[PDB]
Amino acid sequence: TCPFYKKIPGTGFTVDAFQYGVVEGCTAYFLTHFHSDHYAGLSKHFTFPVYCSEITGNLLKNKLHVQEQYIHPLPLDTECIVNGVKVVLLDANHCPGAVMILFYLPNGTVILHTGDFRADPSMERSLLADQKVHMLYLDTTYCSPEYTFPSQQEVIRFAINTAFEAVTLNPHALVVCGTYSIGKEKVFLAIADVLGSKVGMSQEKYKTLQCLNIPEINSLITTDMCSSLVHLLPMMQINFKGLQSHLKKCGGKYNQILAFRPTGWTHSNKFTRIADVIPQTKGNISIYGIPYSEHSSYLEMKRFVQWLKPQKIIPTVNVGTWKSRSTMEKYFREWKLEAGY
Ligand SMILES: CN1CCN(C(=O)c2ccc3cc[nH]c3c2)CC1
Numbered sequence: 631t632c633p634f635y636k637k638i639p640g641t642g643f644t645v646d647a648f649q650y651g652v653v654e655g656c657t658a659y660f661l662t663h664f665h666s667d668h669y670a671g672l673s674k675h676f677t678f679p680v681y682c683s684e685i686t687g688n689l690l691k692n693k694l695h696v697q698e699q700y701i702h703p704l705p706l707d708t709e710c711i712v713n714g715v716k717v718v719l720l721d722a723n724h725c726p727g728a729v730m731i732l733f734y735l736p737n738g739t740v741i742l743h744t745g746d747f748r749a750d751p752s753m754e755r756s757l758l759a760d761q762k763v764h765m766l767y768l769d770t771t772y773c774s775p776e777y778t779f780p781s782q783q784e785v786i787r788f789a790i791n792t793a794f795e796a797v798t799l800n801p802h803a804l805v806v807c808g809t810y811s812i813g814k815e816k817v818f819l820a821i822a823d824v825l826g827s828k829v830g831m832s833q834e835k836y837k838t839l840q841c842l843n844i845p846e847i848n849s850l851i852t853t854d855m856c857s858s859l860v861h862l863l864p865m866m867q868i869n870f871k872g873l874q875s876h877l878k879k880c881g882g883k884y885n886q887i888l889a890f891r892p893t894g895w896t897h898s899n900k901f902t903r904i905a906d907v908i909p910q911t912k913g914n915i916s917i918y919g920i921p922y923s924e925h926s927s928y929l930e931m932k933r934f935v936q937w938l939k940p941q942k943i944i945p946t947v948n949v950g951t952w953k954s955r956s957t958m959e960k961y962f963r964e965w966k967l968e969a970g971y
């Protein structure tokens with residue numbers, strides 16, 4: 631059964647609701663982004679209209695084999711009419727193709743669904759600018775003040791400088807970056823760029839990246855592993871055993887591995903600054919966990935909501951426990967009282 635927080639009232643619409651069979655009364659299914667918790671259920675056999683961004687539509691067609699006749703891509707920042715209701719897609723600052731959705735209900739109510747997002751001040755100058763929003767369906771992933779992390783720019787600076795130092799000291803070092811979904815591409819692209827290398831990867835991962843409309847991508851990625859000194863592997867292989875195994879396969883080209891795991895928040899954010907981060911090392915392998923987030927920090931989320939001043943907030947993450955729900959509700963009230971809405 632489809633949960634209430636995936637339904638848009640006064641419409642025939644659901645958001646990220648593909649794992650519940652045929653949802654009674656749903657005339658159009660929206661998909662915010664191509665992450666598996668959100669697309670779970672879509673396949674070549676899906677025969678209802680799916681509304682999404684162009685990038686998301688490319689991934690549906692080529693990775694899930696959804697038939698073209700049911701994929702309805704919409705341009706960003708453009709008023710569109712869907713089944714008699716005005717909608718707008720906005721960039722979510724999450725992974726490639728991820729959007730927020732504005733719904734203008736026939737009765738005058740305005741609803742913003744953030745999908746997954748990393749709130750940014752730049753959103754305060756989109757089409758949201760002087761738009762009254764009555765209901766906000768909010769990505770509350772990190773809705774607690776302990777969740778701090780650096781800017782994406784600071785984390786990339788650390789990664790570039792770390793990789794460049796290591797490989798300039800040892801030209802026979804290989805760099806490895808973990809991945810398990812789309813998103814966080816800047817990590818491996820920025821490192822390859824500083825090293826003057828293409829990024830080497832599996833055919834399956836290459837296929838995925840070719841769907842993302844990234845400028846000059848043919849110049850940056852390859853399936854020829856032998857030509858590359860930056861390799862991408864599944865996140866599950868980024869451990870001492872898995873990396874030792876990989877090094878064996880490279881045929882004595884390399885004698886050291888520097889590897890990166892781009893996590894979200896971890897407990898070491900409560901203690902350490904990005905400049906001070908150190909790896910776990912065993913012999914000729916080192917592994918850095920770097921806090922590259924594609925979700926709002928607590929402070930970023932707070933600033934967005936206090937700027938927007940919604941009348942009602944509906945959380946879409948951490949909704950399964952009474953303790954989480956009570957904690958989030960207490961922060962929303964704090965934010966409202968501080969800002970005066
Ligand atoms: C930053 N943002 C906050 C929310 N917001 C309103 O609540 C609002 C109030 C009054 C009018 C009158 C026309 N449009 C309006 C929008 C728009 C500005």
Ligand code: NI
Nearest residue numbers: 663665724746
């Ligand atoms: Ni996501």
